């Protein structure tokens, strides 16, 4: 990586900035190979959180009205059952005639 | 009538009565001319209706708007020359007699020359 790919390493060092920081540039790899892991894993967690949030937004947008309509229909069905019982009672009352 | 019906009727009548209230306001410095008479107005409308009757079949048969636009532009150029003549004659007219003479000349010129020109151009199309 870097100077090793060049067969004139002196030219590689001279033509960029005429400066030598190769020691630090090549000793930084050891630290950089592990300095990133906590950030990477926390970023994975945060990306999963964002994905869950997007899925929840989609599900709400698509199904919230459907759930509300289902609940409304359920309550209407309860009223329908009560109405059928009331009609039976009214028919019995008409037939008897207290 | 209901309140809504009354409001709608009031709005319609008020919208129609704009000229009623606009008449009362007039300007002193104004080159007032003699308006064209009702008889001449009706005669010119009848001439225009005759031209429209002559033009109706060809334009209805035509399916592209470009040809209709060309016919309209040519007829409008002719009628606009005649309209300018009528306007300059009537504006200077000093009496209803002169106004009627100008209107009669304009309508006769339509009925003859404009009819012939419309027939010619329609046959060309």
């Amino acid at each position: 990586m870097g100077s090793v790919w060049f067969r004139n390493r002196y030219w590689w060092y001279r033509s960029l900035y005429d400066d030598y920081v190769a020691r630090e540039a090549k000793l930084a790899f050891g630290i950089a190979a592990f300095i990133w892991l906590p950030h990477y894993y926390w970023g994975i967690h945060l990306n999963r959180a964002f994905e869950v949030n997007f899925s929840h937004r989609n599900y709400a947008h698509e199904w919230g009205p459907r759930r509300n309509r289902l609940a409304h229909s359920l309550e209407f069905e309860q009223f329908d059952m009560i109405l059928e019982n009331w009609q039976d009672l009214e028919d019995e009352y008409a037939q008897r005639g207290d | 009538m209901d309140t809504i019906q009354k409001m709608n009727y009031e709005a319609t009548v008020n919208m129609g009565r704009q000229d009623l209230i606009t008449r009362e306001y007039t300007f002193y410095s104004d080159y007032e001319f003699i308006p064209i008479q009702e008889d001449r107005k009706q005669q010119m409308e009848d001439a225009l209706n005759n031209l429209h009757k002559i033009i109706h079949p060809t334009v209805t048969q035509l399916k592209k708007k470009a040809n209709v636009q060309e016919i309209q532009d040519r007829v409008f150029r002719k009628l606009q020359g005649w309209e300018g003549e009528l306007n300059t004659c009537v504006f200077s007219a000093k009496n209803v007699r002169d106004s009627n003479f100008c209107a009669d000349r304009f309508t006769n010129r339509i009925n003859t020359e404009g009819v012939e020109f419309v027939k010619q151009i329609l046959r060309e199309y």
């Binding site: 919230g64 309550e75 209407f76 009223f79 009560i82 009672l89 | -």
Partner: protein
């Protein structure tokens, strides 16, 4: 959308209003709205069940519904 939890109110006046609306709706629907004027509120019908579970259970109960019908007929006659 975050919606906060709240159990049925069971407020006395609110449930009385909802029960009156339900009774009116039942009376009209029994005759199929063959009345001079209509006073049905299906939205309030839904809210009755949503807010007053106790009265809904009473109405579902065969004995409770019978008693309610008898009381309603007595009140209408008187």
């Amino acid at each position: 959308m975050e919606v906060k939890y709240r159990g049925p109110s069971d407020d006395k006046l609110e449930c009385e209003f909802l029960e009156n609306n339900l009774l009116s709706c039942l009376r009209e629907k029994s005759v199929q709205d063959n009345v001079a004027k209509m006073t049905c509120r299906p939205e309030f019908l839904v809210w009755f069940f949503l807010e007053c579970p106790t009265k809904a259970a009473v109405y579902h109960d065969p004995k409770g519904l019978r008693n309610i019908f008898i009381q309603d007929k007595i009140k209408q006659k008187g």
